Design an enzyme around this catalytic site. Sequence first.
Site, short mmCIF file in Angstrom:
data_model
loop_
_atom_site.label_atom_id
_atom_site.label_comp_id
_atom_site.label_asym_id
_atom_site.label_seq_id
_atom_site.Cartn_x
_atom_site.Cartn_y
_atom_site.Cartn_z
N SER B 34 16.89 -35.26 22.06
CA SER B 34 17.95 -36.22 21.87
C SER B 34 17.34 -37.46 21.25
O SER B 34 16.75 -38.28 21.94
CB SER B 34 18.64 -36.56 23.17
OG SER B 34 19.76 -37.37 22.89
N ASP B 36 18.00 -40.37 20.58
CA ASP B 36 18.70 -41.60 20.82
C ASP B 36 17.76 -42.75 20.50
O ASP B 36 17.17 -43.34 21.39
CB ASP B 36 19.23 -41.66 22.25
CG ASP B 36 20.13 -40.50 22.55
OD1 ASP B 36 20.97 -40.21 21.70
OD2 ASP B 36 20.03 -39.88 23.62
N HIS B 60 22.98 -39.24 17.39
CA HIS B 60 24.22 -39.99 17.42
C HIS B 60 24.16 -40.87 16.23
O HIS B 60 23.67 -42.00 16.31
CB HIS B 60 24.27 -40.87 18.64
CG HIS B 60 24.67 -40.15 19.86
ND1 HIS B 60 23.75 -39.73 20.79
CD2 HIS B 60 25.88 -39.77 20.31
CE1 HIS B 60 24.39 -39.14 21.78
NE2 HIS B 60 25.68 -39.15 21.52
N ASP B 89 25.77 -35.53 18.36
CA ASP B 89 26.36 -35.51 19.66
C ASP B 89 27.58 -36.40 19.60
O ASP B 89 27.66 -37.44 20.24
CB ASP B 89 25.34 -36.00 20.66
CG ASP B 89 25.73 -35.67 22.09
OD1 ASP B 89 26.70 -34.92 22.31
OD2 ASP B 89 25.05 -36.18 22.99
N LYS B 91 30.77 -35.73 20.39
CA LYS B 91 31.76 -35.52 21.45
C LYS B 91 33.18 -35.85 21.00
O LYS B 91 33.82 -36.75 21.55
CB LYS B 91 31.36 -36.26 22.71
CG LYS B 91 29.90 -36.11 23.01
CD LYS B 91 29.48 -36.37 24.46
CE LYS B 91 27.97 -36.05 24.48
NZ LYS B 91 27.18 -36.23 25.76
N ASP B 94 39.76 -36.21 20.32
CA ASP B 94 41.00 -36.74 19.86
C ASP B 94 41.87 -35.53 19.56
O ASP B 94 41.43 -34.40 19.73
CB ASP B 94 40.76 -37.65 18.65
CG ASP B 94 41.81 -38.72 18.51
OD1 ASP B 94 43.00 -38.37 18.37
OD2 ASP B 94 41.46 -39.91 18.49
N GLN B 207 24.24 -41.40 34.30
CA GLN B 207 23.47 -40.23 33.93
C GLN B 207 22.80 -39.65 35.16
O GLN B 207 22.32 -40.40 36.00
CB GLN B 207 22.40 -40.56 32.88
CG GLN B 207 21.55 -39.34 32.40
CD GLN B 207 22.40 -38.22 31.78
OE1 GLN B 207 23.24 -37.59 32.44
NE2 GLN B 207 22.15 -37.94 30.49
N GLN B 208 22.80 -38.33 35.28
CA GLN B 208 22.07 -37.67 36.34
C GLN B 208 21.10 -36.70 35.68
O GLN B 208 21.45 -36.10 34.66
CB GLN B 208 23.02 -36.91 37.24
CG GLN B 208 24.18 -37.75 37.71
CD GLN B 208 25.12 -36.99 38.62
OE1 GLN B 208 25.26 -37.31 39.80
NE2 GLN B 208 25.79 -35.98 38.06
N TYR B 209 19.89 -36.56 36.23
CA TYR B 209 18.92 -35.68 35.59
C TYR B 209 18.62 -34.46 36.42
O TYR B 209 18.65 -34.52 37.63
CB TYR B 209 17.62 -36.41 35.30
CG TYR B 209 17.73 -37.38 34.19
CD1 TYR B 209 17.46 -38.72 34.41
CD2 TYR B 209 18.12 -36.99 32.93
CE1 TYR B 209 17.57 -39.65 33.38
CE2 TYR B 209 18.22 -37.91 31.88
CZ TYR B 209 17.94 -39.23 32.13
OH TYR B 209 18.02 -40.13 31.12
N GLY B 227 16.44 -36.73 25.90
CA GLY B 227 16.32 -37.98 25.18
C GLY B 227 15.21 -38.80 25.79
O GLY B 227 14.05 -38.65 25.41
#
Lengths: 256, 256
Positions: B34, B36, B60, B89, B91, B94, B207-209, B227
């Site tokens: 990731s 980021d 992103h 990413d 997401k 819509d 966030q959970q890892y 990330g």
Amino acid sequence: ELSFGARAELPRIHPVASKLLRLMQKKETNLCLSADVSLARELLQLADALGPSICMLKTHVDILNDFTLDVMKELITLAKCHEFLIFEDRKFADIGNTVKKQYEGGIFKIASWADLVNAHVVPGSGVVKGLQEVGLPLHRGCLLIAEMSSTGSLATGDYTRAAVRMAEEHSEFVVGFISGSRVSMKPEFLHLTPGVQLEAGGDNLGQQYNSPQEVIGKRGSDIIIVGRGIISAADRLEAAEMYRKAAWEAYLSRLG
Amino acid sequence: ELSFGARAELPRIHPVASKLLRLMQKKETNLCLSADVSLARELLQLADALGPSICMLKTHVDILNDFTLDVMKELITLAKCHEFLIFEDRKFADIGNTVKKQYEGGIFKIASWADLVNAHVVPGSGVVKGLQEVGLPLHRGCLLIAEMSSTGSLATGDYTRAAVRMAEEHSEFVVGFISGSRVSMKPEFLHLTPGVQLEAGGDNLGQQYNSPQEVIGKRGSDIIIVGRGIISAADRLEAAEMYRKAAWEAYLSRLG
């Protein structure tokens, strides 16, 4: 069931809501124009002509072919002259730590120009979290998408209830909902509803429409988000006014 | 339980998923980086240093301050050179019609360089109908976010379940899932799990890892999206390698 003006003046009223409500009442418009157009020129031309008719111009900058910060400056100019809020309909729906960046930076710099953004509740309250960290600061408000206009939309039952809880438990930043219907009795809270056209029906990719009178009058919503209903029209102004006059009377008729 | 090499060869496998599975095997790596970061330069420097160690680089592009399509071209050059896929990413979440433009157009033209994107199923299938209209043409895959690593995620039960049906009724475009666990039994479907770090933990903003061993070995996932576990490490290259080896070995142990 207060008016807009009275609601602007409610105790628990995010300054964006009140700013918004003060101008709905003032302009007799509960019309949010969904300015889904790819061309800065068009965006800006609709913003101008349509501004005095609207309470909110909703945008997707990630749809904008000739996007530049300069375009939002101009968009803000008109937002200020005609007095409508800018809503960027980014439907943030990532983890807190990402949306943060997505709202504040990159090339879009949404936060620097969007009075309102909305966010999906899927990621959990962290989505609001990450955004408030950017938004609260810059005096912004957020709508939580509690219901969606589209077929198959899983913003129902306790999703919707959860969007409501999330908004209540974050009224510091959430100013309202994207929903098809009224969804909080808390009148501090705005309901903006997409999938609105004067006629009945839907679109090819899953959109579903309802009449302003249905949405505002019957479903108890505050503000109608209307895209192609107006944008696709020839005289977008005439359309807007038809949308304006429609949501306004539905609203007046509810209040009476 | 098929090996990546085998899974690449599947009847209902999307061309993209195999390009991917084919290189997961060849390169002994189920790690998606990731990326980021917010500087193209760092994105590119990482892709390059670390593409030997990764099957995929998740981006992103809307976090990227100095985004240009030229940077993505350079990223692709490194994606071809080193052999990873580019996953944006984004997401999408819509209505069908909006996502289309968001994916094709605006200044990102995600589809011109994103092998993979992902979308939330909350709008209902419109979002995938909308996305595929742009994507099937370009030979792109999409992941549907069925579960989220984030605290209080509303992707659970019949939501996560919806995400799967939606995937299965769109196998033409949907190459798989963003999930915490294996969610489809259909092996054609990639699972890419974010919220992964060697060490137990999380962030502030929900966030959970989980560990590569947890995510891959135990929960059945294919690729880990990593990330900050790598990016914040000082020797990103050694980090990626740890995550590479962890994820590779977990897969090897699950395959075994």
